[PDB]
Amino acid sequence: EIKTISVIGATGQQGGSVARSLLQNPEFHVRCITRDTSSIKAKELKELGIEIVQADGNDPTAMATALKGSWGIFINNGYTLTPAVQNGKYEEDFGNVILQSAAEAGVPHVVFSSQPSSHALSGGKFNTPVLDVKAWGESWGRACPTFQSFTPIMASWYFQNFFIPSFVAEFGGFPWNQDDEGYLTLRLPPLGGNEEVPWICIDEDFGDLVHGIFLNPARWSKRTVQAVGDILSYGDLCTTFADVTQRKARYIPYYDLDDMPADRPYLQESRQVFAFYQMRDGELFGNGITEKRTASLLKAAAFQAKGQKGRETLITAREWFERHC
Amino acid sequence: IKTISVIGATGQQGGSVARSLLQNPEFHVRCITRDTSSIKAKELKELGIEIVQADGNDPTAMATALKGSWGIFINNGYTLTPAVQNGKYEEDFGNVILQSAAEAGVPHVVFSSQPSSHALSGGKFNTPVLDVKAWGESWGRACPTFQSFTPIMASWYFQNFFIPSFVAEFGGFPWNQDDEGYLTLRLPPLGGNEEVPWICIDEDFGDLVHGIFLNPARWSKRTVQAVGDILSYGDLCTTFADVTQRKARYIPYYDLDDMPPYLQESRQVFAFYQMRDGELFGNGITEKRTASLLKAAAFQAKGQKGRETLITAREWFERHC
Amino acid sequence: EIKTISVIGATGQQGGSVARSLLQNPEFHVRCITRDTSSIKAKELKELGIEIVQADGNDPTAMATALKGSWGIFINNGYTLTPAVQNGKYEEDFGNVILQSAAEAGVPHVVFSSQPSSHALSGGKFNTPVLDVKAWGESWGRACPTFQSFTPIMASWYFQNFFIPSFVAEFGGFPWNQDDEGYLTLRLPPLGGNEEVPWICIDEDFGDLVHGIFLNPARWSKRTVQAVGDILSYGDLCTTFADVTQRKARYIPYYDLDDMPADPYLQESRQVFAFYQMRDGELFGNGITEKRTASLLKAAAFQAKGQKGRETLITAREWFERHCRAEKIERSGPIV
Amino acid sequence: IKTISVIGATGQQGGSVARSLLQNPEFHVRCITRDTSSIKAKELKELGIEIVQADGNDPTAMATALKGSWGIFINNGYTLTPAVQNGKYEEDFGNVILQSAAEAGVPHVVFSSQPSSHALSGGKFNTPVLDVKAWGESWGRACPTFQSFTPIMASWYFQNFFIPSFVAEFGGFPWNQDDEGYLTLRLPPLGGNEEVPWICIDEDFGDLVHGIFLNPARWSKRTVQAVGDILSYGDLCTTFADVTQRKARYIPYYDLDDMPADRPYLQESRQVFAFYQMRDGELFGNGITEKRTASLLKAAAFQAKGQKGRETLITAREWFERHCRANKTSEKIERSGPIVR
Ligand SMILES: NC(=O)c1ccc[n+]([C@@H]2O[C@H](COP(=O)([O-])OP(=O)(O)OC[C@H]3O[C@@H](n4cnc5c(N)ncnc54)[C@H](OP(=O)(O)O)[C@@H]3O)[C@@H](O)[C@H]2O)c1
Ligand SMILES: NC(=O)c1ccc[n+]([C@@H]2O[C@H](COP(=O)([O-])OP(=O)(O)OC[C@H]3O[C@@H](n4cnc5c(N)ncnc54)[C@H](OP(=O)(O)O)[C@@H]3O)[C@@H](O)[C@H]2O)c1
Ligand SMILES: NC(=O)c1ccc[n+]([C@@H]2O[C@H](COP(=O)([O-])OP(=O)(O)OC[C@H]3O[C@@H](n4cnc5c(N)ncnc54)[C@H](OP(=O)(O)O)[C@@H]3O)[C@@H](O)[C@H]2O)c1
Ligand SMILES: NC(=O)c1ccc[n+]([C@@H]2O[C@H](COP(=O)([O-])OP(=O)(O)OC[C@H]3O[C@@H](n4cnc5c(N)ncnc54)[C@H](OP(=O)(O)O)[C@@H]3O)[C@@H](O)[C@H]2O)c1
Ligand SMILES: CC1(C)c2[nH]c3ccccc3c2C[C@@]23CN4CCC[C@]4(C[C@H]12)C(=O)N3
Ligand SMILES: CC1(C)c2[nH]c3ccccc3c2C[C@@]23CN4CCC[C@]4(C[C@H]12)C(=O)N3
Ligand SMILES: CC1(C)c2[nH]c3ccccc3c2C[C@@]23CN4CCC[C@]4(C[C@H]12)C(=O)N3
């Protein structure tokens, strides 16, 4: 009756949302995995009544032993890549190691946080390890005969990125620090195409999307899921923020990738991601058109499966600004 | 063989209507103008179009010039008389023509229209440029003589980018670079999700009216939105930048009270649009599906002549910038 | 501060949903209007704690006095038209009389249950009083200079038509009586165009749309609102029913309107169907059929009620899941 | 001038590809066939297209017959060898050709593909008609030599109405009248919202392959759904009825066990439809069914061809108005397709 689901990164944003969503369904038993059960965040997960296991993804045997009995697993990696991984050893990423360990432990159903490979799609003329490592994990999971289901889920930009101070530093004053001309100014290169920039409130929605996948894993196997709460251009984001907060805001694109300030190291290292996205006419996920219909179908299903508990629709940018500003 | 009188055939809207209808042998175009010796009048003559001289302000003359018309397209001008400006919308030459068409027994009417901000805002707003046409719309909707009366509502013309005064007031976009090197567009937000409608008046509007005349009964009393593309002002600028590789940006006029130097009294229109959450047409959501259908229908009625699809903002920039 | 709203037909389906929706917002006070406060349905409302006033729409003066003090009014009419109304004299329908009474009483904000006029749209070819009676009221209210806001709202096919017996008899066994070959068969003419048939759960959704309008009446003045919960073809409706209930169902079109059973109200429905086909299925007459606006209004009411109820409209799949997998066929409707 | 080899150029898919690309001076169409003396091979020759003779089952000859190609469009046939029917998907002549194209150094590939029901369902389904093409898709996606590899996935052809086995097996629609005077279509539901995709293979498909070749890098490793219209089976029949004024209807096989499964291809189609219903109608497996991209690849080819032809895809209504309203005797029901009985 009861299906156990191991949650990687349960102390983190993606896995944290996953754990919080799945625990609200009696058909599932959540086994959070963390490196330190004494962690501040781990104790918060232990206050929700969640089973907590301590293990390190870089230890395949220990990980395999910690996933022994899981019906499903949600896998993700971290913001910091090891030098070996940053230099093209994508098989050494702890997320990818965990996926292989799950194969050995016999876990039948996998939901894997993934990203497109700029290298694979551009014929080798681009290399963006931050994305390509997760894409490697997706290539391994899709080809593995052991799994009964492997579904890649691709996260959008978090709305919560607006709370990172260097975010405010890098991309113009937007959305907290106004400039000399009195504007909350956002400065980013265009995405390309029709400027269909995807955004999500990671906390409230991502976990419910993964939950919806686990409600019927066979239907979603080997079919990429885009975790998208809203789709709008940078300029529409600014006008929406201004309407909500009644604070002047504007968008000034970085049309020339070479003419971005070297003062900003998050613009210079992202210049290959931005170029790959532009080359793809803004189709940043690589599998097909950017659409949030599936996400709105995976959120409603989790809503029903949870007992009509919580919210039935994903958080839009307008609502996030109304709730956070 | 159905005869159609075309008001404003020397103008943008009526000109597109005449040029589109002429390519369907089932329809015979009778252009109406005040001056048949005009350059534009002669251009219409060079295409082999019948040109009759009449003034909309003369109901008696106009009734005589419409006799025998199966249908009529009606439009007015940018110029309102002081009397019309001050509320006597029955005197606008377009609405006079509509009443004359009723007198002459013309059975099928397509009327260039706009919503009445005054009527929709409970009196808060007064915009004669729109409300005058709305007067004709209600009159035609209530008139029992017509067999069909269909209102058509034009979006912003792309060709407004060629009006020097438009370039003057709304920033430099898309011709005049500013100090920081940007083609800058300065406009109040439309409201809602910034679904700003635009049309290439020359190539598409006439085809939409043509499509209406292909089945007047199905469109009677149903407003048609003449929309070629739907996008936000910022999308306009990013599209322009991609097409031309000329830096461009959008800086909204957030406060209609603190606008600059730039005496365009279109403020009440902008405020009414915002009050409608951007639903500038007033009848329902902004949609171009109907326009696309009508354009394709004209394409096929004309013999697969011309374009089957409406001109988008990107294509307009490609062809004119 | 607290805005009073009179609800016509509060004992009925449309007004009942309106009352039940506006009751959950303390900014509004619901004054139900009924002819008989002793009714089973009226006492149901009294048991819910709703003010009940007795008045008859056919009495303009009494109606005016009973509407006095209302900030807003929801107006609707009934399924049975007097013969005089049947033959024109649309001004005499109690809904339209009530609209004029509200104008006399000075009610500033109006939401009116409406439908397109086939006669006005067809150049006289068609005459369907079931629609045209409400269209008369719609134009009268649109032209009325006294109202501060006037919004016409138009109902789609109720899902609850499946509980109305007259629906079950004529339009095939669907969805309760299986037919000779074991099929739940629906027998109806095509709508026209791409078969974009609108449906709504009248009980749970219609009232929330009226509520959403009253939340910002100025923005909706003179703007037709389509009360649409789902848009799907008749065949898609039947296949969805089959998927939900694992019970055979099918759609049998009347391709020839002359071959449709027309044994007085079936004659008015033949003309209505012909008008819809003549409009390529654009049965509302003002523009394309769309449920986007309905969704916006439903969400707005959801928020206003304190995030109570559902944020989304009920689809055909949801309705079949809730009312067929598990329902007495005795609801109010056309008396054929 | 960039040369593109076209597999199956004498067939429906490759034929549309050749006819579309030839009208664009930036490309050279090199048709590939087993028999250059064929009556359909001579039609292509009458169009002014190079015709080379090679067999896909001969990897070396195929390699020498592709060398010099800037791009290649790859497709397979309706008949699979017994070895291929039984799993040996590497032996399908289309997949051998794909390996030959890498072998030959063709830098840009457009591969006719379908999802693998087995791969997506954890082994619950085995439908070689789709999975064979999916094998080639996986190989092309993983091959490091190609500069671009784009899978394109065909919908139901409207031209299935000209394939005789379709008319026989699936109730007779739209040509064979039944007891009650109905053109009856008999098919299981697709699943989900009955978003059945259809395309006019002749007029539209080639333009989509062409649009991909207009910017291969932007489409590399991105599945393209070749869709002209999206509608339910019942909507298909009612649309046909409106166009032709002939009674027509759709009678679903709600229970797949009640579908005629006399012959082996009908049972493999039962398993395919079961897979579709399993995926809630997502018959392509990569994502939602959509025709926006197809409408973007048709318009782009329209422009590339010199604004010649149609800018838009053919809808079901327009196809019925073009092929089933007039008698049009030249439209005979003899097209290549599944040979069931
Ligand atoms: N913020 C963004 O920009 C953004 C948006 C889009 C997508 N992404 C992508 O998603 C990833 C970051 O996701 P996130 O923000 O959820 O990360 P996060 O908040 O740091 O969570 C990742 C979790 O990984 C666990 N972990 C780290 N090293 C580990 C190891 N060696 N073994 C086992 N577990 C380990 C940590 O929890 P324990 O202490 O429990 O082990 C940590 O909480 C990156 O690839 C990023 O590019 C993020
Ligand atoms: N982008 C836009 O500005 C836009 C969009 C929405 C709607 N509109 C509205 O549509 C109108 C402008 O349309 P348009 O571009 O066709 O105007 P236009 O280019 O100025 O043409 C007006 C036409 O009316 C004719 N006319 C003028 N006075 C007349 C009279 N007294 N009797 C008879 N005919 C007369 C003119 O010359 P002849 O009489 O010599 O033929 C001409 O053919 C305005 O009301 C405007 O507000 C335009
Ligand atoms: N699915 C549909 O059939 C549908 C959808 C579109 C529009 N419509 C139209 O809407 C109308 C039916 O709506 P409904 O479902 O609400 O009808 P209903 O269930 O009969 O309710 C009508 C309401 O009006 C009240 N009423 C009836 N006669 C009255 C009178 N003379 N004076 C005052 N109040 C009176 C009734 O209350 P008491 O009984 O106590 O008065 C009742 O609450 C018809 O014109 C129909 O064509 C319905
Ligand atoms: N509606 C549909 O039926 C549909 C939908 C989606 C996709 N598909 C799939 O696509 C395939 C059908 O495509 P189609 O209509 O283009 O096929 P087709 O009409 O059968 O054409 C086959 C082509 O391939 C060539 N060929 C066949 N066997 C060969 C071999 N052993 N070696 C070399 N060449 C060989 C033929 O050579 P010659 O040049 O000598 O004739 C011919 O040009 C099937 O797998 C089908 O399942 C079709
Ligand atoms: C009258 C107006 C405010 C206006 N002022 C202008 C000043 C300069 C250039 C261009 C315009 C336009 C263009 C428009 C475009 N239209 C959109 C629907 C109705 C409306 C409003 C709008 C119109 O009448 N013409
Ligand atoms: C008059 C009608 C044909 C009708 N005949 C019926 C006869 C018996 C049962 C049920 C109905 C209904 C249902 C409807 C629902 N419709 C939604 C759009 C307006 C309209 C028309 C439509 C209506 O007013 N009642
Ligand atoms: C293999 C199949 C079940 C099939 N069986 C048939 C048997 C006889 C006639 C005609 C067909 C077709 C036509 C199709 C149409 N296509 C839609 C998407 C892929 C698919 C599935 C589908 C295909 O491969 N050809």
XYZ file of N, CA, C and O in Angstrom, chain A residues 193-287:
380
model
N 13.693 34.714 -29.239
C 12.350 34.398 -29.694
C 11.351 35.408 -29.169
O 11.579 36.622 -29.208
N 10.235 34.904 -28.645
C 9.154 35.747 -28.158
C 9.292 36.078 -26.678
O 8.290 36.411 -26.028
N 10.503 35.992 -26.131
C 10.774 36.368 -24.746
C 9.841 35.634 -23.785
O 9.187 36.230 -22.928
N 9.775 34.313 -23.945
C 8.964 33.469 -23.066
C 9.826 32.966 -21.907
O 10.212 31.800 -21.827
N 10.128 33.883 -20.997
C 11.004 33.573 -19.870
C 10.203 32.790 -18.838
O 9.175 33.286 -18.356
N 10.624 31.580 -18.460
C 9.896 30.851 -17.415
C 10.391 31.184 -16.013
O 11.586 31.352 -15.764
N 9.435 31.275 -15.088
C 9.707 31.543 -13.684
C 8.867 30.594 -12.842
O 7.792 30.164 -13.268
N 9.362 30.256 -11.649
C 8.588 29.454 -10.711
C 8.874 29.882 -9.278
O 9.994 30.272 -8.934
N 7.845 29.790 -8.437
C 8.012 29.871 -6.987
C 8.410 28.479 -6.517
O 7.562 27.598 -6.354
N 9.707 28.273 -6.292
C 10.206 26.923 -6.047
C 9.524 26.311 -4.830
O 9.027 25.172 -4.887
N 9.353 27.115 -3.772
C 8.919 26.595 -2.479
C 7.548 25.943 -2.575
O 7.361 24.797 -2.154
N 6.573 26.662 -3.125
C 5.187 26.227 -3.051
C 4.783 25.274 -4.166
O 3.833 24.503 -3.981
N 5.472 25.295 -5.305
C 5.016 24.609 -6.507
C 5.896 23.442 -6.938
O 5.369 22.443 -7.463
N 7.224 23.549 -6.809
C 8.082 22.521 -7.393
C 7.754 21.135 -6.837
O 7.605 20.154 -7.592
N 7.655 21.036 -5.511
C 7.382 19.752 -4.896
C 6.073 19.158 -5.372
O 5.977 17.952 -5.596
N 5.046 19.996 -5.519
C 3.765 19.506 -6.015
C 3.881 18.986 -7.440
O 3.185 18.038 -7.810
N 4.755 19.578 -8.252
C 4.937 19.039 -9.601
C 5.557 17.642 -9.546
O 5.093 16.704 -10.219
N 6.602 17.481 -8.731
C 7.208 16.154 -8.584
C 6.184 15.156 -8.041
O 6.125 13.990 -8.469
N 5.382 15.596 -7.071
C 4.311 14.784 -6.508
C 3.351 14.322 -7.592
O 2.966 13.145 -7.647
N 2.939 15.243 -8.458
C 2.038 14.873 -9.531
C 2.652 13.832 -10.445
O 1.964 12.921 -10.914
N 3.957 13.938 -10.693
C 4.606 12.906 -11.497
C 4.497 11.555 -10.798
O 4.133 10.545 -11.411
N 4.811 11.524 -9.499
C 4.777 10.258 -8.771
C 3.366 9.701 -8.633
O 3.205 8.520 -8.308
N 2.344 10.527 -8.860
C 0.979 10.012 -8.822
C 0.705 9.029 -9.957
O -0.186 8.181 -9.836
N 1.444 9.130 -11.064
C 1.286 8.221 -12.203
C 2.606 8.172 -12.960
O 2.724 8.678 -14.082
N 3.632 7.554 -12.368
C 4.981 7.650 -12.959
C 5.077 7.130 -14.387
O 5.871 7.659 -15.178
N 4.297 6.108 -14.747
C 4.419 5.524 -16.080
C 4.072 6.540 -17.162
O 4.689 6.554 -18.234
N 3.081 7.389 -16.908
C 2.656 8.354 -17.910
C 3.718 9.403 -18.206
O 3.685 10.015 -19.279
N 4.636 9.648 -17.277
C 5.614 10.714 -17.418
C 7.020 10.208 -17.688
O 7.939 11.021 -17.830
N 7.218 8.896 -17.754
C 8.559 8.359 -17.938
C 9.148 8.817 -19.266
O 8.484 8.773 -20.307
N 10.408 9.250 -19.222
C 11.171 9.652 -20.402
C 10.532 10.819 -21.145
O 10.855 11.071 -22.310
N 9.629 11.545 -20.488
C 8.999 12.732 -21.052
C 9.364 13.905 -20.151
O 8.891 13.991 -19.013
N 10.181 14.819 -20.666
C 10.641 15.937 -19.857
C 9.473 16.780 -19.358
O 8.523 17.065 -20.092
N 9.562 17.177 -18.093
C 8.592 18.049 -17.443
C 9.291 19.371 -17.156
O 10.380 19.385 -16.572
N 8.680 20.473 -17.583
C 9.199 21.814 -17.336
C 8.494 22.380 -16.107
O 7.268 22.522 -16.106
N 9.261 22.687 -15.061
C 8.696 23.202 -13.815
C 8.548 24.708 -13.977
O 9.460 25.482 -13.679
N 7.382 25.126 -14.463
C 7.129 26.515 -14.828
C 5.847 26.964 -14.143
O 4.797 26.335 -14.303
N 5.934 28.063 -13.400
C 4.777 28.637 -12.748
C 4.224 29.796 -13.545
O 3.016 30.050 -13.536
N 5.107 30.513 -14.230
C 4.698 31.645 -15.047
C 5.655 31.781 -16.219
O 6.822 31.387 -16.139
N 5.135 32.334 -17.312
C 5.913 32.615 -18.510
C 5.663 34.068 -18.885
O 4.537 34.434 -19.243
N 6.707 34.887 -18.819
C 6.589 36.286 -19.202
C 7.979 36.828 -19.478
O 8.972 36.343 -18.932
N 8.029 37.886 -20.277
C 9.289 38.520 -20.618
C 9.798 39.360 -19.451
O 9.072 39.662 -18.499
N 11.078 39.715 -19.523
C 11.661 40.576 -18.504
C 10.912 41.905 -18.419
O 10.615 42.394 -17.318
N 10.561 42.486 -19.568
C 9.826 43.741 -19.557
C 8.439 43.617 -18.951
O 7.996 44.498 -18.203
N 7.735 42.526 -19.253
C 6.440 42.303 -18.619
C 6.602 42.105 -17.118
O 5.764 42.560 -16.331
N 7.675 41.428 -16.704
C 7.967 41.302 -15.280
C 8.066 42.677 -14.637
O 7.494 42.921 -13.567
N 8.780 43.598 -15.287
C 8.965 44.916 -14.684
C 7.654 45.696 -14.628
O 7.348 46.326 -13.606
N 6.861 45.671 -15.703
C 5.599 46.413 -15.665
C 4.636 45.814 -14.641
O 3.913 46.551 -13.957
N 4.622 44.486 -14.512
C 3.787 43.847 -13.499
C 4.221 44.246 -12.091
O 3.381 44.566 -11.235
N 5.532 44.211 -11.827
C 6.024 44.643 -10.524
C 5.598 46.073 -10.238
O 5.153 46.389 -9.127
N 5.733 46.957 -11.231
C 5.365 48.353 -11.028
C 3.882 48.492 -10.718
O 3.495 49.271 -9.838
N 3.030 47.749 -11.429
C 1.599 47.845 -11.153
C 1.289 47.382 -9.739
O 0.470 47.996 -9.042
N 1.916 46.292 -9.300
C 1.616 45.764 -7.974
C 2.099 46.728 -6.894
O 1.347 47.105 -5.989
N 3.370 47.119 -6.964
C 4.009 47.898 -5.912
C 3.864 49.401 -6.101
O 4.164 50.156 -5.171
N 3.433 49.851 -7.278
C 3.375 51.274 -7.606
C 4.736 51.947 -7.434
O 4.821 53.135 -7.114
N 5.804 51.190 -7.675
C 7.165 51.708 -7.716
C 7.674 51.599 -9.147
O 7.555 50.543 -9.779
N 8.216 52.695 -9.662
C 8.669 52.725 -11.047
C 9.724 51.657 -11.318
O 10.657 51.465 -10.531
N 9.556 50.937 -12.426
C 10.516 49.917 -12.820
C 10.607 49.868 -14.339
O 9.687 50.274 -15.053
N 11.748 49.380 -14.827
C 11.995 49.322 -16.264
C 13.003 48.226 -16.575
O 13.744 47.769 -15.702
N 13.008 47.800 -17.840
C 13.924 46.781 -18.346
C 14.770 47.358 -19.475
O 14.228 47.865 -20.464
N 16.085 47.283 -19.320
C 17.041 47.727 -20.325
C 17.905 46.535 -20.719
O 18.796 46.127 -19.973
N 17.670 45.942 -21.888
C 18.400 44.718 -22.246
C 19.889 44.952 -22.464
O 20.330 46.039 -22.843
N 20.670 43.903 -22.189
C 22.065 43.819 -22.629
C 22.048 43.196 -24.019
O 22.136 41.981 -24.185
N 21.903 44.045 -25.035
C 21.814 43.546 -26.399
C 23.138 42.965 -26.882
O 23.143 41.996 -27.648
N 24.259 43.537 -26.451
C 25.584 43.083 -26.856
C 26.188 42.288 -25.705
O 26.468 42.843 -24.639
N 26.389 40.986 -25.920
C 26.956 40.159 -24.861
C 28.386 40.569 -24.541
O 28.840 40.384 -23.406
N 29.113 41.112 -25.523
C 30.481 41.541 -25.262
C 30.531 42.830 -24.455
O 31.509 43.077 -23.743
N 29.484 43.655 -24.546
C 29.456 44.975 -23.930
C 28.806 44.972 -22.554
O 28.362 46.027 -22.085
N 28.727 43.815 -21.907
C 28.305 43.739 -20.515
C 29.493 44.070 -19.618
O 30.634 43.744 -19.950
N 29.240 44.726 -18.487
C 30.352 45.102 -17.603
C 31.125 43.876 -17.129
O 30.540 42.873 -16.717
N 32.459 43.965 -17.201
C 33.316 43.000 -16.520
C 33.255 43.164 -15.008
O 33.716 42.278 -14.278
N 32.678 44.268 -14.529
C 32.446 44.469 -13.106
C 31.531 43.399 -12.512
O 31.528 43.212 -11.289
N 30.767 42.685 -13.349
C 29.729 41.754 -12.907
C 30.116 40.316 -13.267
O 30.028 39.927 -14.443
N 30.669 39.485 -12.332
C 31.175 38.127 -12.681
C 30.064 37.087 -12.935
O 30.408 36.008 -13.394
N 28.802 37.373 -12.576
C 27.640 36.452 -12.786
C 27.106 36.682 -14.212
O 26.316 35.834 -14.664
N 27.450 37.802 -14.871
C 27.062 38.096 -16.289
C 28.114 37.443 -17.200
O 27.729 36.962 -18.295
N 29.395 37.432 -16.793
C 30.470 36.983 -17.649
C 30.520 35.470 -17.688
O 30.735 34.884 -18.754
N 30.285 34.813 -16.547
C 30.289 33.353 -16.576
C 29.037 32.769 -17.218
O 29.080 31.646 -17.734
N 27.925 33.504 -17.207
C 26.677 33.080 -17.829
C 26.573 33.400 -19.309
O 25.545 33.065 -19.916
N 27.619 33.985 -19.914
C 27.595 34.445 -21.339
C 27.399 33.243 -22.297
O 26.931 33.504 -23.421
N 27.830 32.009 -21.960
C 27.561 30.837 -22.824
C 26.128 30.321 -22.661
O 25.496 29.907 -23.644
N 25.590 30.358 -21.441
C 24.187 30.007 -21.240
C 23.291 30.967 -22.018
O 22.351 30.553 -22.709
N 23.562 32.269 -21.903
C 22.731 33.259 -22.582
C 22.807 33.099 -24.097
O 21.790 33.201 -24.794
N 24.008 32.855 -24.624
C 24.185 32.656 -26.057
C 23.476 31.398 -26.538
O 22.870 31.393 -27.613
N 23.567 30.311 -25.769
C 22.869 29.085 -26.137
C 21.361 29.301 -26.141
O 20.662 28.847 -27.055
N 20.842 30.003 -25.133
C 19.415 30.296 -25.092
C 19.000 31.139 -26.295
O 17.997 30.849 -26.957
N 19.765 32.194 -26.594
C 19.450 33.040 -27.741
C 19.497 32.249 -29.044
O 18.630 32.410 -29.910
N 20.500 31.391 -29.201
C 20.630 30.552 -30.383
C 19.419 29.644 -30.538
O 19.033 29.290 -31.649
N 18.824 29.266 -29.409
C 17.647 28.412 -29.396
C 16.352 29.205 -29.474
O 15.283 28.652 -29.200
N 16.425 30.486 -29.836
C 15.243 31.341 -29.949
C 14.451 31.368 -28.647
O 13.219 31.461 -28.658
N 15.148 31.277 -27.517
C 14.516 31.325 -26.220
C 13.984 30.002 -25.712
O 13.505 29.945 -24.570
N 14.060 28.939 -26.514
C 13.611 27.606 -26.105
C 14.670 26.993 -25.190
O 15.403 26.066 -25.542
N 14.744 27.548 -23.981
C 15.847 27.246 -23.078
C 15.848 25.814 -22.558
O 16.884 25.361 -22.061
N 14.735 25.087 -22.652
C 14.689 23.725 -22.128
C 15.120 22.682 -23.151
O 15.486 21.567 -22.759
N 15.090 23.016 -24.442
C 15.696 22.206 -25.474
C 14.845 21.085 -26.032
O 15.143 20.589 -27.124
N 13.801 20.665 -25.324
C 13.002 19.535 -25.780
C 11.818 19.947 -26.641
O 11.326 19.128 -27.429
